Every structure is written in structure tokens, then in C-alpha cells.
RNA sequence: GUGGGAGAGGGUGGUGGAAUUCCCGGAGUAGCGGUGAAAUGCGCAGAUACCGGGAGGAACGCCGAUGGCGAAGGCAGCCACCUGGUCCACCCGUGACGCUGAGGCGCGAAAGCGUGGGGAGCAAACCGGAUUAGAUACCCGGGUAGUCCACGCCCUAAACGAUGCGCGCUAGGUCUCUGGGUCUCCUGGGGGCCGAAGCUAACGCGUUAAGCGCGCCGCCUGGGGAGUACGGCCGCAAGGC
């Protein structure tokens, strides 16, 4: 119980690859992509948000790894 | 012909003279590959998750296009050419896939 | 004798040993220490209370050279890397933060046969 | 890929009457189009064996249709064969 | 036929980041590594750890599944192109054009072979260090073929659902992927579990049959001797049938 990142949206584009504090929303404290678990998304869902999220990171607007604070 | 999308990622450190020489360039590259121009966006520098060729930030151009399929693969070819040219990301234009709307 | 007074901690921590690098701002080394460093010699280098002496071998022969405040880095997991970060903690060093950085690859290499699986 | 202009072409021009689609002529017709198509990808691409299992299939459906026609009205296929010109 | 759809299905070209290794530089100094414990190994020609720059090869973390696709083998970063299969709705077209399939032809993991490249990491053989009663091995340090690419061969397998293909028929419940719908839900096509009837030596199977039927193919006939011998066919060979 935390809560799903899709009910914290409105209406957004999945296929956006240039919407960045949008799909930020859906990377964890690393840069890694959120399970299903977290993202609430659907398979379909999820699956366009994956290729979406990567070409966003090969275009230099995501992160593919962040390093982790405190410890 | 085909509908894509030419995104292009340039030197954030270009003064005006050398960015509107990338501008030019670009825009007659796509003729020359037989791409018309629907849209763009301009949203010039932005800051990058990693950095780019020792560099924090980048230039950010975006196209809308409708060109000829068979061409597409040299039209990027061509764009990388260009010492300046960080990245280049061409895609075939899809509708919107929404979710909560 | 650059008398540096803030700056980087990276913590080495394998299964193996434990090992310091106190740096300045910008990475470079100031002092170091380790399992080995310290009188430890064989498996001994690897438990945590080795790292412990070691951080703080590393922590005292940088006070010598005047730092005041560090920045944590954590690269591997092994044993006692948690008690190599506590020994900072009060080393009388201010820690002012703390972050893991371990290498992980996309799957670039084959592993030793030790490794896989 | 095949464009709808093109296979609308290739109908209207096999078709038995106007509305036929499906009869033997246009299906062999339609057929012989994407084998004459996949055969020139695989002319180059000598590597691409999932594909030609396709051509494979089109290919024998094909010969069954022709096979059929011919059993069945001698004239009609020989009129398909000598205009898509296949095996003569 | 028309209109849609999902997909690591295939081929070609391009490209991205993480890591390893090596090289160059800075800073730094006495060890690093490795194990049950060690040693060989590496390090004062400055290693390990840290920062910056560079070269190169190979595989694509999270997503990722209980998932998907493919006839099988198998298929996973991203992009474009070329291309196969398949599902649904409409019920528009042909009018039995169907099923199976000896031989043939094609595909066929890994290892292996040929020629030419490439070679970071890994690693048969091999060289070492240990352990042991000895250790030809298990652990540790090295390391060649190979692993990678092009083209050509090889044709095997726990090539496994150990379950040939097709169609019809016989309770349901539940989870799931992907369509269409009047969208609690109904209706298709897949993937799973539990179960009616029935089957089964049992274990189990049970609308994804191992049930009830029809068609066609392949195959078995006690264990060894033996997938051996002989012969034939194929292969450069290893060897295969
Ligand atoms: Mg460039
Ligand atoms: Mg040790
Ligand atoms: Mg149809
Ligand atoms: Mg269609
Ligand atoms: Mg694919
Ligand atoms: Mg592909
Ligand atoms: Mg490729
Ligand atoms: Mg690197
Ligand atoms: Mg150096
Ligand atoms: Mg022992
Ligand atoms: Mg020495
Ligand atoms: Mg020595
Ligand atoms: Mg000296
Ligand atoms: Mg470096
Ligand atoms: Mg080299
Ligand atoms: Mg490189
Ligand atoms: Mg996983
Ligand atoms: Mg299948
Ligand atoms: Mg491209
Ligand atoms: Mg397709
Ligand atoms: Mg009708
Ligand atoms: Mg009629
Ligand atoms: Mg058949
Ligand atoms: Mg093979
Ligand atoms: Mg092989
Ligand atoms: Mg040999
Ligand atoms: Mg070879
Ligand atoms: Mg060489
Ligand atoms: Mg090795
Ligand atoms: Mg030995
Ligand atoms: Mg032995
Ligand atoms: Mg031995
Ligand atoms: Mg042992
Ligand atoms: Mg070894
Ligand atoms: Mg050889
Ligand atoms: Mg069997
Ligand atoms: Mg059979
Ligand atoms: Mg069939
Ligand atoms: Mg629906
Ligand atoms: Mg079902
Ligand atoms: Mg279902
Ligand atoms: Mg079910
Ligand atoms: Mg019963
Ligand atoms: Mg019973
Ligand atoms: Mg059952
Ligand atoms: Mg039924
Ligand atoms: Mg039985
Ligand atoms: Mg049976
Ligand atoms: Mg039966
Ligand atoms: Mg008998
Ligand atoms: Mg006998
Ligand atoms: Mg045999
Ligand atoms: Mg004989
Ligand atoms: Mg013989
Ligand atoms: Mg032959
Ligand atoms: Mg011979
Ligand atoms: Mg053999
Ligand atoms: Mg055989
Ligand atoms: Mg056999």
C-alpha cells in the first residue's frame, strides 16, 4: 500500500516519448522502470510504456541508471 | 509515402550564426531526401538525464514529416553527418495511446 | 599537505576485503586504507570488523591532512560495507550523505563458471 | 508491402464480373501478385527461410486452385495460365 | 474480399547505454587478489581503490510475467526498411476447390569441419597452485581451439507435452494474453490450474483428452549381444541414415 502511478495521472499519451515529469513519474529512485505492481498499468499498458521510456532515455531525456541515496 | 517523425539533438554550447547553419543544413537534407515538412517543434536546450558528448544539456529540434519509405534509413544517414549532430531519432508517427482520459 | 577539509568517502566492498579511498572534491585521492592495510591478512581482510579499522585508519590519516566533512560512496556488497558506513558515521568525520553506486551490468560479459547460474 | 490501389487493380482485372473477389481467377491472380512479390525479397535476403516457408504455402495453394480450375473448366484455366503466364 | 488487431516470427542496415578488459593521463601508497584455510598469481618499472580521456569486442539490466510469437529448432535494447504466419468483425465473393501424406525437396539447438575475418569476457586441451591415502578430478591462478562474423558443410539431441496431423461430439469453476460487443458481463482465438462423464496398471488425463468417434501417416513385438557387424547411401572429416 503505497499507491499506482496511473491513479496519481489524468489523461496522458503512453506513446509520448517526449513528455518527460510524465514519465519520469514511472521510474523508482534508480532510473529502472516500475513493475506493475507500481505503475498500475494494464499489460498492454506497461508494454507501450517500456519502448516509450526507451527511446525517451536513448534520447537523452531519461535516465537509464541513477545512483541511490543514503544507505 | 510515410508519416515520421525526425527528432534531432544538436550543440547546446552553438551560437546563433553555427545554429542557424545546423537549421539550414537539416531543413535541406530533408528536401533533398523527399520529405515534406508538416510541423515543428522547436524546443531548443533542455537538460539531459546523462550527458551527451561530455556535454549536460542539448538542442532539441522536432519534425513532423511525410516522405518516401525506401529513403528514410539515408535521410538519417545524412543527418548524422554533421560534426554538431548528437543524436538523431527518426519514428514512424503513430496515433496517441492514451489511458484516463 | 593540500589541507582539503571536505570531501568524498568511497567504500570498496567485497566478499574478499574492504577498501577506503578518502578523496578530494574532485575523486582524486588524499588517503586510503583496507583489511590488508591494517595487520589482517587472509580471510581475515573480509569481516566486518576489519572494515570498521580500516574506514577508520582511512578517516584518521585524513583528519590528518585537515578534512572535516565527507560524502559517502558505496560500491559492492560484502560483508561489513554497512559496518565500514558506521565507522564513518562517528569517525568524527561528518558524513553528509550516503549513496550506493555498485556496478551492475546490462548483461555485457560471461561470468566465471563461478558465477553463474 | 502490396497497396490496396494495386490489389483493387489486379481484381478488377481478373474478376469474372464486377463484385467477384473470390473466385478462382482472382484468388490465383491475387496469389501469383505476393509469390512474385515474396520471390523477389527472397532473391535477395537468401537467408530469411520463415518467410519462404510462406512462399512454400502460397505456391501450393496456388497449384491446388489451378489444379481445381483445370479439372473443372479446361477453357478458364488455360485462358489464366497463358494471361498470367505460369509454367507457360 | 473489405475493415481492424496483438506479437522477442524472419531478413537487412543503422544506432544507445551499463559493465568487463586494455591503453593514456591525474591523484595516491603497500598491498591487491583469492580460499574452508591457503598458495600460485599480480604489485616499488607504483598495482589495488578513486577521477578524467581513448580503443575494442560481446551480451542487452529494469520492463519481464504466471506473458508473447513461431511448424519445429528457436526468438528479447532502440530505429527504419523488406517480409512470413495468425486472430477478430462484416457475412460481400468462388462453390467441395477438402484431409492425410510413402518417396522427394527444404528447415533444423550445441558441439564439430572448411576458407577468410574477428577475438573484450568466458574457456575443452594444456601449464601451474592447492586439497587428498594418491587427485589424472571437484577449489584457486593462467590459458589455446572454440565461443563472435561472412560464405560453404555437418543433420545430431532428455529436437520433451518423452503425447503425429485433421474434423465432429461430450458438465463446469477460476486466473490470464489478444480481438469484437448492447462492456456486472456475453462472444471469438490463445495460455494455465481445479474438476463432470468417461479413460487409465497406476501415477494421472479430463472442450489445450490420455474421453467418445472417422480419415491418413509414422512406429512397437522380452532383456542382453547392439544402434554393434556386414552391405548400401550420404560426409572433406568427425561421423550420420
Ligand atoms: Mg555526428
Ligand atoms: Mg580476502
Ligand atoms: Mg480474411
Ligand atoms: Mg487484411
Ligand atoms: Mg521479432
Ligand atoms: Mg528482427
Ligand atoms: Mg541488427
Ligand atoms: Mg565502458
Ligand atoms: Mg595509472
Ligand atoms: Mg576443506
Ligand atoms: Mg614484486
Ligand atoms: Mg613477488
Ligand atoms: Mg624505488
Ligand atoms: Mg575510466
Ligand atoms: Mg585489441
Ligand atoms: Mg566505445
Ligand atoms: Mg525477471
Ligand atoms: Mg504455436
Ligand atoms: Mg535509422
Ligand atoms: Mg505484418
Ligand atoms: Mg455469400
Ligand atoms: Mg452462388
Ligand atoms: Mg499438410
Ligand atoms: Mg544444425
Ligand atoms: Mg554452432
Ligand atoms: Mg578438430
Ligand atoms: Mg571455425
Ligand atoms: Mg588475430
Ligand atoms: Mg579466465
Ligand atoms: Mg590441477
Ligand atoms: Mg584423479
Ligand atoms: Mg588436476
Ligand atoms: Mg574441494
Ligand atoms: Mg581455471
Ligand atoms: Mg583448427
Ligand atoms: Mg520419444
Ligand atoms: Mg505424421
Ligand atoms: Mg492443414
Ligand atoms: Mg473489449
Ligand atoms: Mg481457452
Ligand atoms: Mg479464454
Ligand atoms: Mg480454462
Ligand atoms: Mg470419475
Ligand atoms: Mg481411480
Ligand atoms: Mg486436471
Ligand atoms: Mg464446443
Ligand atoms: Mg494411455
Ligand atoms: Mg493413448
Ligand atoms: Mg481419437
Ligand atoms: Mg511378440
Ligand atoms: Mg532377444
Ligand atoms: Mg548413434
Ligand atoms: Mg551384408
Ligand atoms: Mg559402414
Ligand atoms: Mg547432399
Ligand atoms: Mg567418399
Ligand atoms: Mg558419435
Ligand atoms: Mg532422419
Ligand atoms: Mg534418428
Given at each position: 500500500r503505497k499507491a499506482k502511478?496511473?491513479?496519481?495521472?489524468?489523461?496522458?499519451?503512453?506513446?509520448?516519448?517526449?513528455?518527460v515529469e510524465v514519465l519520469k513519474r514511472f521510474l523508482s529512485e534508480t532510473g529502472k522502470i516500475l513493475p506493475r505492481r507500481r505503475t498500475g498499468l494494464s499489460a498492454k499498458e506497461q508494454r507501450i510504456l517500456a519502448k516509450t521510456i526507451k527511446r525517451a532515455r536513448i534520447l537523452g531525456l531519461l535516465p537509464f541508471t541513477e545512483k541511490l541515496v543514503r544507505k | 509515402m510515410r508519416r515520421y517523425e525526425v527528432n534531432i539533438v544538436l550543440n547546446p554550447n552553438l551560437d546563433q550564426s553555427q545554429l542557424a547553419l545546423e537549421k539550414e543544413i537539416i531543413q535541406r537534407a530533408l528536401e533533398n531526401y523527399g520529405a515534406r515538412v508538416e510541423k515543428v517543434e522547436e524546443l531548443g536546450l533542455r537538460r539531459l538525464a546523462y550527458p551527451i558528448a561530455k556535454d549536460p544539456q542539448g538542442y532539441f529540434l522536432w519534425y513532423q514529416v511525410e516522405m518516401p519509405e525506401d529513403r528514410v534509413n539515408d535521410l538519417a544517414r545524412e543527418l548524422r553527418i554533421?560534426?554538431?549532430?548528437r543524436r538523431v531519432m527518426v519514428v514512424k508517427s503513430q496515433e496517441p495511446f492514451l489511458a484516463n482520459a | 599537505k593540500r589541507q582539503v577539509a571536505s570531501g568524498r568517502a568511497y567504500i570498496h566492498a567485497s566478499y574478499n576485503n574492504t577498501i577506503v579511498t578518502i578523496t578530494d572534491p574532485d575523486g582524486n585521492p588524499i588517503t586510503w586504507s583496507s583489511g590488508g592495510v591494517i595487520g589482517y591478512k587472509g580471510s581475515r581482510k573480509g569481516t566486518p570488523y576489519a572494515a570498521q579499522l580500516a574506514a577508520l585508519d582511512a578517516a584518521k590519516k585524513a583528519m590528518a591532512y585537515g578534512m572535516q566533512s565527507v560524502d559517502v560512496i558505496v560500491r559492492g556488497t560484502g560483508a561489513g560495507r554497512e559496518q565500514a558506513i558506521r565507522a564513518l558515521?562517528?569517525?568524527?568525520?561528518?558524513?553528509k550523505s550516503i549513496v550506493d553506486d555498485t556496478p551492475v551490468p546490462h548483461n555485457g560479459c560471461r561470468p566465471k563458471k563461478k558465477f553463474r547460474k | 508491402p502490396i497497396t490496396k490501389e494495386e490489389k483493387q487493380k489486379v481484381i478488377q482485372e481478373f474478376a469474372?464480373?464486377?463484385?467477384?473477389?473470390?473466385?478462382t481467377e482472382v484468388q490465383v491472380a491475387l496469389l501469383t501478385l505476393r509469390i512474385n512479390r515474396l520471390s523477389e525479397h527472397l532473391k535477395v535476403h537468401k537467408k530469411d527461410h520463415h518467410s519462404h516457408r510462406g512462399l512454400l504455402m502460397m505456391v501450393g495453394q496456388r497449384r491446388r486452385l489451378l489444379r481445381y480450375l483445370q479439372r473443372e473448366d479446361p477453357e478458364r484455366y488455360r485462358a489464366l495460365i497463358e494471361k498470367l503466364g505460369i509454367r507457360g
Amino acid at each position: 500500500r503505497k499507491a499506482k502511478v496511473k491513479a496519481t495521472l489524468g489523461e496522458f499519451d503512453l506513446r509520448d516519448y517526449r513528455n518527460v515529469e510524465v514519465l519520469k513519474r514511472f521510474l523508482s529512485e534508480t532510473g529502472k522502470i516500475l513493475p506493475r505492481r507500481r505503475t498500475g498499468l494494464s499489460a498492454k499498458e506497461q508494454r507501450i510504456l517500456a519502448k516509450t521510456i526507451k527511446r525517451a532515455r536513448i534520447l537523452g531525456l531519461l535516465p537509464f541508471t541513477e545512483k541511490l541515496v543514503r544507505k | 509515402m510515410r508519416r515520421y517523425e525526425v527528432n534531432i539533438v544538436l550543440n547546446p554550447n552553438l551560437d546563433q550564426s553555427q545554429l542557424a547553419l545546423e537549421k539550414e543544413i537539416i531543413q535541406r537534407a530533408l528536401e533533398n531526401y523527399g520529405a515534406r515538412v508538416e510541423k515543428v517543434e522547436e524546443l531548443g536546450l533542455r537538460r539531459l538525464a546523462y550527458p551527451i558528448a561530455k556535454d549536460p544539456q542539448g538542442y532539441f529540434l522536432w519534425y513532423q514529416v511525410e516522405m518516401p519509405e525506401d529513403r528514410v534509413n539515408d535521410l538519417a544517414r545524412e543527418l548524422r553527418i554533421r560534426d554538431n549532430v548528437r543524436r538523431v531519432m527518426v519514428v514512424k508517427s503513430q496515433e496517441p495511446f492514451l489511458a484516463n482520459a | 599537505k593540500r589541507q582539503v577539509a571536505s570531501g568524498r568517502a568511497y567504500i570498496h566492498a567485497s566478499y574478499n576485503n574492504t577498501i577506503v579511498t578518502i578523496t578530494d572534491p574532485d575523486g582524486n585521492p588524499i588517503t586510503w586504507s583496507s583489511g590488508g592495510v591494517i595487520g589482517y591478512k587472509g580471510s581475515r581482510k573480509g569481516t566486518p570488523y576489519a572494515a570498521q579499522l580500516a574506514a577508520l585508519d582511512a578517516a584518521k590519516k585524513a583528519m590528518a591532512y585537515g578534512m572535516q566533512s565527507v560524502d559517502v560512496i558505496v560500491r559492492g556488497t560484502g560483508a561489513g560495507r554497512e559496518q565500514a558506513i558506521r565507522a564513518l558515521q562517528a569517525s568524527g568525520l561528518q558524513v553528509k550523505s550516503i549513496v550506493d553506486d555498485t556496478p551492475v551490468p546490462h548483461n555485457g560479459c560471461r561470468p566465471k563458471k563461478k558465477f553463474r547460474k | 508491402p502490396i497497396t490496396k490501389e494495386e490489389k483493387q487493380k489486379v481484381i478488377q482485372e481478373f474478376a469474372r464480373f464486377p463484385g467477384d473477389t473470390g473466385s478462382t481467377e482472382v484468388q490465383v491472380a491475387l496469389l501469383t501478385l505476393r509469390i512474385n512479390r515474396l520471390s523477389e525479397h527472397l532473391k535477395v535476403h537468401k537467408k530469411d527461410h520463415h518467410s519462404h516457408r510462406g512462399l512454400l504455402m502460397m505456391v501450393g495453394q496456388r497449384r491446388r486452385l489451378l489444379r481445381y480450375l483445370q479439372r473443372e473448366d479446361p477453357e478458364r484455366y488455360r485462358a489464366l495460365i497463358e494471361k498470367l503466364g505460369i509454367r507457360g
